[PDB]
Subunit: 293 residues, 4 copies
């Protein structure tokens, strides 16, 4: 069965103004590439090629102008708008006809993931054709997230959205896998007390049916979010340190598509040409004539 | 006499791609505000209110959308396009009718300055109504800049553009003050195929009309031209702002302190942004004395 | 009249353990040099050559091993021990016979200052031979410091130590100048069980002898008291040094520029370090003019 | 068969002066703990409890004063001096009687490792009772390291120490596993043209006998070194970003010994007591009453 992807690139409102008066949030760079390359790479590493980008009416054309239809990277990218920021779970109503009767995956536009065998840790989630899969990650400030409570045998028994009194330090990360029920679950939701269709309510719905798999994303993975000026900066420094140490890029879509066999050596060479003058083009050119294990 | 300002916010080419496939370099943020706010604040701190922004045809509307005509901040901002990146000295040909018969000042769009009594160090340059003024600053890699050589008595005797063998570690920073002769000097290419600002400055030096002031080690002059240096500049500005609770290069603040806009106008500007830290900061400025 | 200096480099307790189980906080490096070089350079920039370092019994030998008696840098460094951390004002009782009948200056061991004409901003404080002088600096978290309140005409009217409800955002920085009365003021505990420097400063304020000078936003005053702030201060100093090719708080440099040691002495100091960047930097200073 | 560990904490000379006039290099902190906690944690994660720390005559007592005999953390730590920095391979001559007839592992004192299932990636190396095991890692500046060349089928065929013209971008990291031959291999070495007993010559000796296993440490691992002022700073920022995001520490020996079952809850509580006032003590206390997966 096919799995489709959605990237939710919502409007951060005026919270990052005036930086985001110039460019949309998920167009801001993290070190050396646009923020949106990171969640796109995550979907690509899960084996997902068919992807809907959802953003504001102002920002959608800008994502389109940047990314096109994805064919240069062996992807099929489509676009849709969220007129009003009425909660993340709206992505499934907006995305209803894109999803059709297929399996899906949702990723937040400002989330970055780094670590080992990331290709394989997503594989187990992506292959599960029934129910929902999410990842829990130990954090210092769980109040800011969806928080998962486990019983004494490590079984997930409760999910709470931004609790004032968190039950654990396990946050739910911004990457979600769903089966064919998610659209119908979303339509039956009622708005929260904040006036939003919450993704945690979608996840609670699967939990109450005993169909939520909660996998642990271990301490040896980096899950970062780029939602404040401070966290964007930190994420920049983190990616720069890795790239400058390794001479290998994090979340380079051209590279990921080449290694996945979605584009070939000739196509990668064409992509490198316009950028040959700068470090990013030189990097893509180097990939053709080097074995990276 | 009036002094007009020019900000050269040109096409970064492909050097910062793909980050700048989203936008021109001078729209990228340095920590919490667009790059272009920093050179704009420098011009404002020199007392300059009438400013021409020069950028690519593609980027001009984006600067316009960000900054408008400047009237909200007591400024008069105008725009011009540079079809092709043919050297920094082209700013005076493109900007010829904007400048008219007035004094001018040119600043590069990716330069940031921080330090003490900055308002006052620019004052002496801005109020000199004859000849040209530039600033020299000790750097580690002078080969990347215009380099000034001094004689034993501290007099400038030579300028060189990006020398492979620099004569000193004094770079000429990206801020230049000119009198009414600069357009005519400019109208009169290098081996690289560009109209060099260093040739304009050499022209003033050879007629004995170049003031070279030292910008001391207690000032920060940073360049935001690479991915690495943009990140560094971000960390630097964050550290200062988070330490002080005072912003670097907030134009609304600078206009308010210059008396270009008043308390009521500042309050209006703060309203739309009230929900975020930047709006809250502008609101706090109304009810606090900063010395 | 002579002014003597004191650096309080006391026991950080257990707050930075286990990092400081290796050494006292003021021996940790800020980027490329020990923390203590920064407050020592501040005292030197004020013209102070005779300096008492106060630290724990365990740490004193380590400071001594690092710094010696100071003669290599044209200084006279003396050491005293603080058995117990009983407040910053204890420095004047411990330091009583070192001070004698002279003027004094106290600096905290984990404070760093950067900015323009810093030599000259300290000069006005250092040369005031009567009363006390402190500096006020706008900060984001004034609750962590001594806080000064000003009246409508910018006169200091109140000082409070770590107030839960600060009257302003002006903190008193960790650098203090005193006349001959401070020892007697000091000899005359808070609810926390400590001899507070803010009580010493209040005493001078109540006799109308406290000069409170503003350290403006164009200066950097950083505190290296947490793991996070020490890291930030490191990044800040690295950015400046790597931009300029000039060091912050290099005592050998400061002594050379103050004329306390000469070219031959500086060359001797550079020899043992010739293999690393710090030695190479001292060697470069001999054959370059820095304005 | 037992495996013993050596941490080489050598004298960086005057290269980091004057910072290292106050404290020895491997006593400098990386963010919130002494540099040496990081390579010690690496050895502990390989299951090694018996460890020799080698450093200069000036620095050895300082390591002793910091770490003791290791019994508080369920370790057995011993100390030895290297009078003169005559190459890293000297560690096996100095360490000869400590090693005895056992298997060994050498780790450099200024190397930091971060990533997933790190416990398990070392397990395969630690269990190999014959020959030597090293790790290769893609880097940007391979000239600074021991560089491994691979043939077309991914077999290691050459090792070069700091080559002017590197054959690949695969550096050998500062962690080495050896069998009972390493002492004898080291004694038969001749000094290099630089006047040092090189670890690369020890590794070449195993390669020429076909007994060098070279495993790839993938791009999803962070291998950092803390040998310059700049790299020490970068490593600090990197560790701070991870710790402040996760509320979990990197390379906390007390934690690693507790999770390995080398010390128990009561012993961990005793260790936390003296430090209760600060964040590190509070962290150890929190570990007693939380499940970390
Ligand atoms: O940020 C990344 C993470 C990553 O794992 N990779 C390697 C991905 C890969 C490897 C082999 C087969 C298929 C895919 C990457 O190019 N960039
Ligand atoms: O980035 C800055 C640097 C600065 O100096 N200032 C102070 C400006 C000022 C102008 C006129 C009278 C008094 C103060 C600022 O608001 N932002
Ligand atoms: O950290 C610093 C800050 C500073 O201003 N200086 C310049 C000191 C000086 C002293 C006397 C005459 C001229 C210059 C320095 O060498 N290191
Ligand atoms: O820097 C680290 C890396 C690490 O993996 N861990 C967990 C280690 C562990 C887990 C389970 C059983 C045995 C050991 C750690 O405490 N600190
Ligand atoms: Cl893990
Ligand atoms: Cl200066
Ligand atoms: Cl100032
Ligand atoms: Cl990997």
């Amino acid at each position: 069965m096919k799995r489709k992807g959605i990237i939710l690139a919502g409007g951060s409102g005026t919270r990052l103004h005036p930086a985001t008066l110039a460019i949309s949030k998920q167009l801001l760079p993290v070190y050396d590439k646009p923020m949106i390359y990171y969640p796109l790479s995550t979907l690509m590493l899960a084996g997902i090629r068919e992807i809907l980008i959802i953003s504001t009416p102002q920002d959608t054309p800008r994502f389109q102008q940047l990314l096109g239809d994805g064919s240069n990277w062996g992807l099929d990218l489509q676009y849709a708008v969220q007129p009003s920021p009425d909660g993340l779970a709206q992505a499934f109503l907006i995305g209803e006809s894109f999803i059709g009767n297929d399996l899906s995956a949702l990723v937040l536009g400002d989330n970055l993931y780094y670590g080992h065998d990331f290709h394989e840790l997503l594989g187990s989630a992506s292959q599960r054709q029934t129910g929902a899969s999410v990842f829990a990650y130990h954090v210092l400030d769980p109040e800011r997230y969806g928080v998962v409570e486990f019983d004494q045998g490590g079984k997930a028994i409760s999910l709470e959205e931004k609790p004032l009194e968190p039950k654990s330090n396990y946050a739910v990360t911004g990457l979600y896998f769903y089966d064919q029920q998610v659209v119908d679950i979303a339509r039956d939701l009622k708005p929260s007390p904040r006036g939003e269709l919450e993704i945690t309510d979608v996840n609670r719905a699967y939990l109450e049916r005993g169909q939520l798999s909660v996998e642990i994303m271990g301490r040896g993975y980096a899950w970062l979010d780029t939602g404040t000026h401070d966290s964007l900066l930190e994420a920049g420094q983190f990616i720069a340190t890795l790239e400058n140490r390794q001479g290998l890029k994090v979340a380079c879509p051209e590279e990921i598509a080449y290694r996945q066999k979605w584009i070939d050596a000739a196509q990668l060479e064409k992509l490198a040409a316009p950028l040959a003058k700068n470090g990013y083009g030189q990097y893509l050119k180097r990939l053709l004539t080097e074995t990276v294990y």
